[PDB]
Amino acid sequence: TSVGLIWAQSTSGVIGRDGGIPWRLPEDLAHFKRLTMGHTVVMGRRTWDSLPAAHRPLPGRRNVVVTRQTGLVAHGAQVVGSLEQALSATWVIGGAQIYALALPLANRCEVTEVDVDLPPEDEDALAPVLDQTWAGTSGEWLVSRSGLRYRMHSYRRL
Ligand SMILES: NC(=O)c1ccc[n+]([C@@H]2O[C@H](COP(=O)([O-])OP(=O)(O)OC[C@H]3O[C@@H](n4cnc5c(N)ncnc54)[C@H](OP(=O)(O)O)[C@@H]3O)[C@@H](O)[C@H]2O)c1
Ligand SMILES: CCc1nc(N)nc(N)c1OCCCOc1cccc(C[C@@H](C(=O)O)C(F)F)c1
Ligand SMILES: [Cl-]
Numbered sequence: 001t002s003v004g005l006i007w008a009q010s011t012s013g014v015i016g017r018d019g020g021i022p023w024r025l026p027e028d029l030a031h032f033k034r035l036t037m038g039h040t041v042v043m044g045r046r047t048w049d050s051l052p053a054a055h056r057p058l059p060g061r062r063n064v065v066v067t068r069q070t071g072l073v074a075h076g077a078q079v080v081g082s083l084e085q086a087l088s089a090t091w092v093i094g095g096a097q098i099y100a101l102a103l104p105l106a107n108r109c110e111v112t113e114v115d116v117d118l119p120p121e122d123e124d125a126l127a128p129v130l131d132q133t134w135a136g137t138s139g140e141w142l143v144s145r146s147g148l149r150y151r152m153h154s155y156r157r158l
């Protein structure tokens, strides 16, 4: 199947801190739900842990959790020991370690950029860096109901 990555980052590249996402952006949650609904969503074990309880597993999607643990069970989800096992449309939904594993297999990235100043600090989860072999285009800067500015980028591998 075609593999896409989807993530939201601060301009500095931070995607996660302290076991969660360091902003609220309802329009990004709607974007994420819309693009992933009905598809397989592949995530690292720490991202599974980070889902708020009311949203775990993510409804309407085949949830696949990647772990090195034996006998990890994730209620309502499928558990695999490698990205290759996860990939047999598929969306990789994070976090930083699973993005790095999936990027060589992906042909599409959908990125939300959040206009917040979050200097990377120890133990932050960071977004993957796309090189110039990714074609990209950007939507407009928009003001979120949360107060923050954001915009969506779409990338396709050449
Ligand atoms: N803003 C966003 O778009 C976004 C998206 C997703 C998550 N997040 C945030 O990012 C953070 C979580 O990301 P993270 O980078 O810490 O974790 P992660 O990538 O979601 O999960 C890491 C875990 O994946 C498993 N794993 C990693 N490499 C593996 C391999 N080669 N084979 C098998 N299993 C492997 C391991 O599980 P075991 O330890 O169980 O072996 C590892 O501890 C949280 O803060 C979350 O809120 C943000
Ligand atoms: C949503 C943040 C996000 N943003 C983009 N762009 N990429 C991503 N990888 C991503 O992380 C996916 C992992 C976290 O996910 C959720 C966190 C809180 C609630 C929900 C449920 C959501 C749904 O049902 O999807 C509902 F609120 F609409 C998911
Ligand atoms: Cl919270």
Ligand SMILES: [Cl-]
Residues within 6 Å of the ligand: 023, 024, 025, 026, 029
């Ligand atoms: Cl939010």
Ligand SMILES: [Cl-]
Residues within 6 Å of the ligand: 024
């Ligand atoms: Cl909320």
